[PDB]
Amino acid sequence: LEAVRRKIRSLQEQNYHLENEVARLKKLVG
Amino acid sequence: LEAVRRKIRSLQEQNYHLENEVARLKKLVG
């Protein structure tokens, strides 16, 4: 449970990080 | 456990979804 509780917070951190950065570029890019 | 373990799968699963989506876009819109 503990290994999985840290994974999802690391992964949740980046999930949006990725949905934010991928987006930010798109608007940014064209 | 399953909240973490449906969404660990899902979140990792998105943590390459966008993670290799971003990449390509780097070398696409780039």
Shortest CA gap A17–chain B (Å) = 9
How many whole angstroms separate alpha carbon A17 and alpha carbon B5? 21
Q: Give chain A's contact residues with B (Cβ, < 8 Å).
A: 1, 4-5, 7-8, 11-12, 14-15, 18-19, 21-22, 25-26, 29-30
Q: In angstroms, rounded to a whole number, what is the distance separating the alpha carbons of residues B9 and A11?
A: 10
Provide φ and ψ at B2, rounded to 5°.
Answer: -50, -25
Experimental method: X-ray
Q: Of B19, B10, B16, which is closest to residue A21 (Cα–Cα)? A: B19
Sign of the Cα pseudo-torsion (A28, A16, A13, B13, in order): negative
Q: Which two tokens stand for residue A15?
A: 């999930």
Expressed in Å, this structure's resolution amounts to: 1.0
